[PDB]
């Protein structure tokens, strides 16, 4: 498999022992961008600019 | 070690941007590159930020 | 929550260069001569005030 | 000859001739760890690097 | 070589810097493989 990289903003979550366990790609979809703006992987009900 | 650099021939222009001449030997650098070339006297000023 | 955010922002403001070469005062004072270190420290002081 | 450096933090392959000093633990000391200048108390850590 | 196309999913994430961070969320602007991007399977 071959893919090509792109300049992106990622939100990386580090676990207790220091390994990356999850990430959010900000430019993928509006929900991911909301997560990047709030700096959290869970978003509560509401309207977020 | 910049002691030998000072011990070399007297310098027409020894100007340090980010750093300070004397404060060198006191710092720790990630990737030193040195670019050597020959230019005229009035062209020395053009090599500057 | 509000209080926390304020304090958090304040701490993050210590990681801002405010136009200086570095956001760490010790690094600046270990990198530059006192005259230019004065200018950089002045920018940092203005930002933090 | 134009000398180009990059100033950052710990990761560095070039330092000045400054010698070393044995480690001290559980005392508030000044430390210069491979270009990282600070003050604090140094303890053995369980963090997994 | 034969070219097929497939979904990368959440593959291709790497450590950006030589810094250890624990129990934190960090924002990085860097070259990454975009999530759910089409990648080429070569045979
Ligand atoms: C991941 O963290 C857990 C929780 O402390 C620990 O038991 C485990 O050894 C860690 N794994 C690695 C590879 O560090
Ligand atoms: C990758 O797959 C998607 C989904 O089928 C498709 O829309 C897209 O055209 C594919 N990429 C290329 C270069 O064909």
Swiss-Prot record, chain D:
Effect upon mutating residue 9 to P: Increased resistance to human covalescent sera neutralization
Location of the region described as Disordered in the Swiss-Prot/TrEMBL record: 9-31
Domain of life: Viruses
Protein's job: Attaches the virion to the cell membrane by interacting with host receptor, initiating the infection. The major receptor is host ACE2. When S2/S2' has been cleaved, binding to the receptor triggers direct fusion at the cell membrane. When S2/S2' has not been cleaved, binding to the receptor results in internalization of the virus by endocytosis using host TFRC and GRM2 and leading to fusion of the virion membrane with the host endosomal membrane. Alternatively, may use NRP1/NRP2 and integrin as entry receptors.
Subunit: Binds to host ACE2. RBD also interacts with the N-linked glycan on 'Asn-90' of ACE2. Cleavage of S generates a polybasic C-terminal sequence on S1 that binds to host Neuropilin-1 (NRP1) and Neuropilin-2 (NRP2) receptors. Interacts with host integrin alpha-5/beta-1 (ITGA5:ITGB1) and with ACE2 in complex with integrin alpha-5/beta-1 (ITGA5:ITGB1). May interact via cytoplasmic c-terminus with M protein. May interact (via N-terminus) with host bilirubin and biliverdin, thereby preventing antibody binding to the SARS-CoV-2 spike NTD via an allosteric mechanism.
UniProt protein name: Spike protein S1
């Amino acid at each position: 498999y071959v893919g090509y990289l792109q300049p992106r903003t990622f939100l990386l979550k580090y676990n207790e022992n220091g390994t990356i366990t999850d990430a959010v790609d900000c430019a993928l979809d509006p929900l991911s961008e909301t997560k990047c703006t709030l700096k959290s992987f869970t978003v509560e009900k509401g309207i977020y600019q | 070690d910049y002691s030998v650099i000072y011990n070399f021939a007297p310098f027409f222009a020894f100007k340090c941007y980010g750093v300070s001449p004397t404060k060198l030997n006191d710092l720790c650098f990630t990737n030193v590159y040195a670019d050597s070339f020959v230019i005229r006297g009035n062209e020395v000023s053009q090599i500057a930020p | 929550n509000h209080n926390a955010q304020a304090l958090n922002t304040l701490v993050k403001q210590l990681s801002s260069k405010f136009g200086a070469i570095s956001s760490v005062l010790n690094d600046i004072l270990s990198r530059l001569d006192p005259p230019e270190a004065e200018v950089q420290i002045d920018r940092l002081i203005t930002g933090r005030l | 000859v134009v000398l180009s450096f990059e100033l950052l933090h710990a990761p560095a392959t070039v330092c000045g001739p400054k010698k070393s000093t044995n480690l001290v633990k559980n005392k508030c000391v000044n430390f210069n760890f491979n270009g990282l200048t600070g003050t604090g108390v140094l303890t053995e850590s369980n963090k997994k690097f | 070589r034969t070219q097929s196309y497939t979904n990368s999913f959440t593959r291709g994430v790497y450590y950006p810097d030589k810094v250890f961070r624990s129990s934190v969320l960090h924002s990085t602007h860097d070259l990454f493989l975009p999530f759910f991007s089409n990648v080429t399977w070569f045979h």
